Design an enzyme around this catalytic site. Structure first.
Site, PDB file in Angstrom:
ATOM      1  CG  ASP B   8      -1.719   1.286   1.349  1.00  0.00           C
ATOM      2  OD1 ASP B   8      -2.452   1.627   0.398  1.00  0.00           O
ATOM      3  OD2 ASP B   8      -1.601   1.960   2.401  1.00  0.00           O
ATOM      4  CG  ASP B  10      -1.847   8.026   2.373  1.00  0.00           C
ATOM      5  OD1 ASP B  10      -1.029   8.966   2.298  1.00  0.00           O
ATOM      6  OD2 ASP B  10      -2.794   8.020   3.189  1.00  0.00           O
ATOM      7  CB  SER B 175     -18.119  11.321  -3.712  1.00  0.00           C
ATOM      8  OG  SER B 175     -16.826  10.816  -3.450  1.00  0.00           O
ATOM      9  CG  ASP B 177     -15.269   5.591  -4.848  1.00  0.00           C
ATOM     10  OD1 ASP B 177     -15.490   6.590  -5.561  1.00  0.00           O
ATOM     11  OD2 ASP B 177     -14.285   5.491  -4.093  1.00  0.00           O
ATOM     12  CG  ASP B 205      -2.409   2.354   6.226  1.00  0.00           C
ATOM     13  OD1 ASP B 205      -3.096   1.782   5.354  1.00  0.00           O
ATOM     14  OD2 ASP B 205      -2.335   3.594   6.333  1.00  0.00           O
ATOM     15  CG  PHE B 217      -4.728  -8.370   5.511  1.00  0.00           C
ATOM     16  CD1 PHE B 217      -5.493  -9.259   6.257  1.00  0.00           C
ATOM     17  CD2 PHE B 217      -3.456  -8.044   5.962  1.00  0.00           C
ATOM     18  CE1 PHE B 217      -4.991  -9.825   7.419  1.00  0.00           C
ATOM     19  CE2 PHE B 217      -2.946  -8.604   7.122  1.00  0.00           C
ATOM     20  CZ  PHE B 217      -3.715  -9.496   7.852  1.00  0.00           C
TER      21      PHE B 217
END
Ligand SMILES: O=P([O-])(O)O[C@H]1O[C@H](COP(=O)(O)O)[C@@H](O)[C@H](O)[C@H]1O
Ligand SMILES: [Cl-]
Ligand SMILES: [Mg+2]
Ligand SMILES: [Mg+2]
Ligand SMILES: [Mg+2]
Ligand SMILES: [Mg+2]
EC number: 5.4.2.8
Lengths: 242, 242
Positions: B8, B10, B175, B177, B205, B217
């Site tokens: 990942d 960020d 918003s 998704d 994380d 994961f």
């Protein structure tokens, strides 16, 4: 009496999608020692900076991005406006909602995204969505010509609104514009009419019906001059003002 | 057999919302002499460049922006897929028609533009409009929690589009998704699957249910590891490869 020169920017002081040339910028600065000058364009202040330099506010007496919805005078912001504050949230929503509801019912081959583009001086509406590809634009524009989609959806909007001071203008290939009556280039004139100019020259290049500059050119408040290119704008200014 | 690390971005390689640290960047490259490494994030390719360096594609064996709908392997772009082709043009138009009708019915303080943004692997839907200003963005966010606007919308969407192979995820402030079942971060395993890796390690994380790393994961193709910060990612990788 005293006078003002107003210039469309794109196509008049500049070549299409090109920045101003140092030579023209200098002519204009020399011309300001003879007469007040100002510029008007449909583009936001950011774009106008791209076109005439980041010092624009300090180099012209008046600057009127967004057809005048933003206004600078003698280096200060004179006024600021948007379609939201004018029409109001209630009316701005009634309009958005109807447009949305109406687009949900249109049978199309394809639908994408950004059906409503919110600009500070109009609402672009696009049945297909502006995010379409170029090959999908064409497919729609051709279908529109046989089924007249945009024309019927303006028609029904002109029935349900327009008594609220709204104009509708189909344009381009996939969309139409909803803006308050008179929010074309004529808007800028309100910031200079009470400043005591016996004559306000205007130079633009899309002066015929349809063009960005038509409605301002024909306004009786202007001395209108059509132009073909920057060189032609110097030519005419040289002859008017020696 | 040979192995692969998938990170990942960020919060795993970088502190949240921040570039990676040179310390962490040079570590990864020292690891790369022992193992092929790759990265994965939801963000568009340009955002990834801003977090890991312009030349990301050359410094990581695999690069998977937009959860992998866009994918680089050894510097070159891999075959691509878009939401229009997977779901079909009818379910796209039936899902847009519904979202549009529903937004028209929402009473809100403000509505603006770009209610549906058409992405490569999803559709945002913003009840208020993505073109909204910053002040208007926080307004909708802080009202949404009082009246659960988005939460209520997503729920009706699930009922109507039950069984249609779509997932929904409220993320951010304005918003949510919509994306095909399986187009979370685990979309990218389609590319690294095969290619002869007996073990695929994954670091993330937000392993917890409802996090953007949860499903990759738990996916059995991956040896999942939960991380609490960049410096922790090091600890697990230093434990594994030294
Ligand atoms: O805030 P928005 O409306 O721009 O939303 C943005 O961020 C969300 C999650 O971001 P995070 O997990 O960091 O909160 C995404 O789901 C969303 O697609 C994106 O547009
Ligand atoms: Cl939209
Ligand atoms: Mg022009
Ligand atoms: Mg005139
Ligand atoms: Mg993360
Ligand atoms: Mg796993």
């Amino acid at each position: 009496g005293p006078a003002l020169c107003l210039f469309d920017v794109d196509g008049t002081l500049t070549a299409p999608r090109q920045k101003i040339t140092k030579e023209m910028d200098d002519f204009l600065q020399k011309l300001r020692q003879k007469i007040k000058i100002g510029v008007v364009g449909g583009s936001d202040f950011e774009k106008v900076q791209e076109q005439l330099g980041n010092d624009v506010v300090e180099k012209y007496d008046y600057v009127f991005p967004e057809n005048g919805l933003v206004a600078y005078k003698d280096g200060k912001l004179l006024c600021r406006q948007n379609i939201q504050s004018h029409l109001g949230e209630a009316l701005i929503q009634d309009l958005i909602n109807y447009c949305l509801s109406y687009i949900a019912k249109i049978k199309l081959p394809k639908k994408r995204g950004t059906f409503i583009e919110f600009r500070n001086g109009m609402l672009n509406v696009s049945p297909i969505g502006r995010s379409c590809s170029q090959e999908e634009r064409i497919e729609f524009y051709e279908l529109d010509k046989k089924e007249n989609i945009r024309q019927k959806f303006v028609a029904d909007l002109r029935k349900e609104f327009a008594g609220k001071g709204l104009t509708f203008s189909i344009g381009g290939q996939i969309s139409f514009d909803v803006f308050p009556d008179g929010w074309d280039k004529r808007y800028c004139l309100r910031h200079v009419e009470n400043d005591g100019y016996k004559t306000i020259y205007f130079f633009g290049d899309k002066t015929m019906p349809g063009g960005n500059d038509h409605e301002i050119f024909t306004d009786p408040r202007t001395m209108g001059y059509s132009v073909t290119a920057p060189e032609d704008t110097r030519r005419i200014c040289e002859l008017l003002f020696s």
